[PDB]
A paper describes a structure:
Calcium-activated chloride channels (CACC) facilitate transmembrane anion conduction in response to the increase of the intracellular Ca2+ concentration. The most prominent CACC is formed by TMEM16A, which is expressed in different tissues of the human body. Structures of both functional branches have revealed the general architecture of the family. These proteins form homodimers with subunits containing ten membrane-spanning segments. Our study reveals the location of a hydrophobic gate at the intracellular entry to the neck that controls ion conduction in TMEM16A thereby contributing to the tight regulation of its open probability.
To characterize the structural relationship between residues constituting the gate and address how their mutation to alanine stabilizes the open state, we studied WT and the mutant I551A by cryo-EM. We next investigated the structure of the constitutively active mutant I551A in the presence of Ca2+. Although at a lower resolution of 4.1 Å, the general correspondence of the mutant structure to WT emphasizes their equivalent properties in the Ca2+-bound state. Whereas the mutant resembles WT in the Ca2+-bound state, the Ca2+-free structure of I551A exhibits pronounced differences compared to the corresponding structure of WT. Sidechain truncation of any of the three residues by mutation to alanine causes a strong increase in the potency of Ca2+ and results in pronounced basal activity.
Residue numbers in the entry:
A (entry chain B), B (entry chain A): 117 to 130, 165 to 259, 267 to 466, 488 to 668, 683 to 910
The structure:
């Protein structure tokens, strides 16, 4: 008895009298083409539509889409707009749904203001067919859930054509983009594990690792705490140092070059795939501007200046946005400063002494992650509020400005931890003699023994494991399900089952999360190789997970059309242009690559290197400490202390210069900047060259569109 | 008696019998629409055409151009393709000429192969009307020569519409581009002379100039020659040093930032002007691909592999092109090395002693300029030959590849003088103790006293004066005129007068020369401000000069159509992207800006600077010379010599280190690279931001194209 319907509405069964008055007035506008029909239920009833056929011809030449034809060149039919195809039973419920949605948009108060009132609840099309049923008559939703949206069929491809024709163009483009993303993430991940195993095959045969773990030399160290620690041996940090060697060999620079070139070729390959996709569907997705009705506060402000009687308002909301994002980055760095106070002075009062010193930084990044998720929530909501106060012109413009503001907020708050740990961790602290004070209090911030890269490597590694594979996937699969179970604490028609499903929130969260992952996996690959492995695993989970989400825990979308990806290809190009200038900085300002090379070239006095640590570790006469800055226990853990060493490129204390800037500091900084210059310029040239040499329209469409134009112009005479 | 004609041909009046046989066969193809007519003359006769009217309707819907309409919105008529306008006497001779040229192209052997044979000479349309006559009946060529192409009307604008409608789209776009170029060159030139007068207003009040010209201190100098000179005083070079101060103040960095931002906004403004221009003419210049007949050796090679039975050939001609351009840059630097041997050892044997030392470098750049003009000729001819051996597909592809190869050749051979003088002049010579030998002969190359910038400044200044204002303009106005006078050593119908005029050589020389000038005036503005002044003068001459050239000493062009500028906007964007990375290098590696700033910041021990020269001038004990490297006359010109000074950032000889690399050398190199990094990254961001924030379609076309589409769709019903 379930007939052929389209795009139900909501009636609010028992101001409310004004609400039902307009909810009966506007259906007189809505029966200008199609008479409605209503429904019955137990909670609250609703309205419904039954389109008759020629109305879709009445708007089809008014909304010209290139539907199917009768002819075919080479066993692949061509497409034309609307004339004399006349099959009369060949439309699709996606097309019929977006047509009747267009008609619902056509009414004027419009339907958007009606939804903003509360006279309705939601007006969304109905899903055709119950998935995973007992005897269900092969509808495309159930077939798609069977063969696309469960993890057993993760190994085979994605049915792009059917997911488009059932969900519309936007979700089809998004999932085809995720498919191209994973398939281009495959070879970069394979070369990533190749360079990782190169690191493991030279985890021993490199020299400074052995020079660090060679015992009996009793290489002491300055305490790197204000007062609550003592001197110690570098060979106690040799484990983390040998671990750090794994990521910064002279092959990780090749890996970084490969990943930047990979971002370039992925961008070009996705342009080509999207062009072929738009060929395989509607030949253009071009629609005439101002198709949407102008937004409600636009016309309200029009009437306001009509009763009142500008250029300052966009600029003032832009500068207050700049103040917002600057307070956001400062709040990110101060919340990382707070996260450095995870367990301050556990030695003195608690004295539990778990003796790991990898669990404390893990606790720090854990509390940073939970507070930054909360700040993501606050920034998203207040950014949506601010873009509402924007009063933008159209929904395309409002949506673009909103997603730009929200991506800038999310990007800065979820990247300034890693940026701060890379380039502002110990670059600012003074020498062992004197330390810079934070609001005249004490030492600012100092980082772990055995390289300052490994802290960032572990933080980024477990941010990529946790907040992508585990945390975000599990909360996305759980939180709407848990809201459903909360309501579940509190026959079955297709409207009746479609009411309880979750409303749609757009494509912005999936785009935003995947672009955050892209920002990781092309901004911080040089210090941390095998980021494409975790991005591959998250994507393998994510495509089928969000497929299952769409087909099970989501109401039917409205199936809008847009041949462009959106703002997100521009944001991808932006992150790809930022990738080289941050990879250069991470190689030349965190890794031990460039000092290793400059010591191999200049001060070697031999073929290969030896005593590199014995070269960089400048000493410090312990008589020259400041008052109070002495360690509380010169315990003589090993040999003895008379001096302490530290690798800050300074002169020895016995020189007439005491602890000033030595020359080799200027030498290594010169070589560092020389590498940044040559790296950035050369590989930026190589990126723009591999974008020039790649055609953006391949040799299979470039002739074929003209060939079907030949077929059209030869048929069109008579 | 001069009736209404179109596009004459050439008949070769008395193999030759085969020549006249095909020259009678193909006119049977050519009378498929239009019967010909012939002519009589004294030297050698010709053929001619008289189009009848409806043939242009017969190809007009076949070649759809948006001609004029009958209606108008807002006193500006709209345009439509070809239906029911029916004025029957409204075509233009430009349109009729390109139509009959299209018909001449339509014949198959085609007309291009016929011109390649020699059976013809040339087939070009006729100019309508003799310019500057006594009683001439107001034809557009004479009017255009009166009011556009003579230097008295240089002060007013350019008539873009009429020069298009008389010459076609390509020359119209070119001259409108030159107009936009000059009009956007105006404000950059004004700010250039502002920063120049700032330099003149601080030519005295800066400190190191006074510290150089302060006498009685007897600041000696190392000889900077192998053997044939002596020591000397820096105050003898203080004149050129005070001149050098004029160009490298801390305001020339602002000027360089302004010029790079100017290149960005000129690019955007020219995109906007070209878009508005294409609105003001044909709404699209889009034509269906493969409109041209495939090239002759393409089909010949098709038949060759048809009788013979690839991917290697494009790659082998590309690598041989790379070998060609590498030999070109090496030949440029070796010809500058030869040009350094202008007058070697004039002191010893000739002893004329003109005592200028500005005339010798002028002679060097003069001989470099004449030999590089000869090399331009050789490279252009052999590059045309190589692109013929390319066997390209179409004339668009062949022309693009040819102009790319020729521009790369011309650009490298006419820029490696300035690049070599900037960044490879004295950066490679050793210390005064030991010098690097060129093929174990003697000292490589050393540059002038009083800064090494001023040599480049004078060389670039007089290359911009001579080889743009004087030499190229005078040879372009002279050489075809002189060939005409050579033939002049050896009634008057329009064909009869049109035969003796010069054939057309395309737009590539004017584009190429103007892009070379752009490359100067945005690649080397930082060292040499007021390059926009000379570019403004050359352009003010050049627009009216080439206008006069077109309308007087040039046959009528064929008036092809293309809505794009061509490859030249891409080449402009390329030079604009190279501009920042070469301006950064010229500021931080030739100027005295960044060492001035690093001495102002670090080693000052005072507020402002003093003894900057006394800081950089490291000394040299004269006992430590090599054998033979001593000067031939320790003449004691002034005080006395016991040591010689030189500004190469080395330690004094009395240190236990003798003449090694000092620390402050590493310091200033670090600061240099830091400035290159911050400059390049910041202003590249500012360029891409000022390209983002500028819309590429203004608010006067964006609505108006849709408004005339509204008019078209409202008229088109009935
Ligand atoms: Ca997730
Ligand atoms: Ca997700
Ligand atoms: Ca010239
Ligand atoms: Ca010229």
């Amino acid at each position: 008895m379930d007939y052929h319907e389209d795009d139900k509405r909501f009636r609010r069964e028992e101001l409310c009298r004004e609400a039902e008055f307009l909810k009966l007035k506007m259906p007189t506008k809505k029966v200008y083409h199609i008479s409605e029909t209503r429904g019955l239920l137990k909670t609250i009833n609703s309205v419904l539509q039954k389109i008759t056929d020629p109305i879709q011809p009445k708007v089809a030449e008014h909304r010209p889409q290139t539907t199917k034809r009768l002819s075919y060149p080479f066993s692949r039919e061509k497409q034309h707009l609307f004339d004399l195809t006349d099959r009369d039973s060949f439309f699709d419920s996606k097309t019929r749904s977006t047509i009747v949605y267009e008609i619902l948009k056509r009414t004027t108060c419009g339907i958007t203001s009606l939804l903003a009132n509360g006279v309705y609840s939601a007006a969304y099309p109905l899903h055709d067919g119950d998935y995973e049923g007992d005897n269900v008559e092969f509808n495309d939703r159930k077939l798609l859930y069977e063969e696309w949206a469960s993890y057993g069929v993760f190994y085979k491809y994605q049915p792009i054509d059917l997911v488009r024709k059932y969900f519309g163009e936007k979700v089809g483009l998004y999932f085809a983009w995720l498919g191209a993303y994973t398939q281009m993430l495959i070879p970069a991940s394979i070369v990533g594990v190749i360079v990782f195993l190169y690191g493991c095959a030279t985890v021993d045969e490199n020299i400074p690792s052995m020079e660090m773990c060679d015992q009996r030399y009793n290489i002491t160290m300055c305490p790197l705490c204000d007062k609550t620690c003592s001197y110690w041996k570098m060979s106690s940090a040799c484990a983390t140092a040998r671990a750090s060697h794994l990521f910064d060999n002279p092959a990780t620079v090749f890996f970084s070059v490969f990943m930047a070139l990979w971002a370039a070729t992925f961008m070009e390959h996705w342009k080509r795939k999207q062009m072929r996709l738009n060929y395989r569907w509607d030949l253009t997705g071009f629609e005439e501007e101002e198709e949407a009705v102008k937004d409600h506060p636009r016309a309200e402000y029009e009437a306001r200046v009509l009763e009142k009687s500008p250029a300052y308002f966009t600029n003032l909301v832009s500068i207050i946005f700049m103040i917002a994002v600057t307070f956001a980055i400062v709040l990110g760095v101060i919340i990382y400063r707070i996260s450095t106070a995870a367990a301050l002075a556990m030695n003195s009062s608690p004295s539990v002494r778990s003796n790991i010193r990898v669990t404390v930084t893990a606790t720090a990044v854990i509390i940073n992650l939970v507070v930054i998720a909360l700040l993501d929530e606050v920034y998203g909501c207040i950014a949506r509020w601010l873009t509402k106060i924007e009063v933008p012109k159209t929904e395309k413009s409002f949506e673009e400005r909103l997603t730009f503001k929200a991506f800038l907020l999310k990007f800065v708050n979820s990247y300034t931890p890693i940026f701060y740990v890379a380039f502002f961790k110990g670059r600012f602290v003074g020498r062992p003699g004197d330390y810079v004070y934070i609001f005249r209090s004490f030492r600012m911030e100092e980082c772990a023994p055995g390289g300052c890269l490994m802290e960032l490597c572990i933080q980024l590694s477990i941010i990529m494991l946790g907040k992508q594979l585990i945390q975000n996937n599990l909360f996305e699969i759980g939180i709407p399900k848990m809201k459903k179970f909360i309501r579940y604490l509190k026959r079955k028609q297709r409207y009746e089952v479609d009411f309880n499903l979750e409303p749609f929130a757009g494509l912005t969260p999936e785009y935003m999360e995947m672009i955050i992952q892209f920002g990781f996996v092309t901004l911080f690959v040089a210090s941390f190789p095998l980021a494409p492995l975790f991005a591959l695993l998250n994507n393998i989970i994510e495509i089928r997970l969000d497929a299952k989400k769409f087909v099970t825990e989501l109401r039917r979308p409205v199936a809008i059309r847009a041949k462009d990806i959106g703002i997100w290809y521009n944001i991808l190009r932006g992150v790809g242009k930022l990738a080289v200038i941050i990879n250069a900085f991470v190689i030349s300002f965190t890794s031990d690559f460039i000092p290793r090379l400059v010591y191999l070239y200049m001060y070697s006095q031999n073929g290969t290197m030896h005593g590199f640590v014995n070269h960089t570790l400048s000493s410090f006469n312990v008589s020259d400490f400041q008052n109070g800055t002495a360690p509380n226990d010169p315990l003589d853990l090993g040999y003895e202390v008379q001096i302490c060493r530290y690798k800050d490129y300074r002169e020895p204390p016995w020189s007439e210069h005491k602890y000033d800037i030595s020359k080799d500091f200027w030498a290594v900084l010169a070589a560092r900047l020389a590498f940044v210059i040559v790296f950035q310029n050369l590989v930026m040239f190589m990126s723009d060259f591999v974008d020039w040499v790649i055609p953006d329209i391949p040799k299979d469409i470039s002739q074929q569109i003209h060939k079907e134009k030949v077929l059209m112009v030869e048929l069109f005479m008579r």
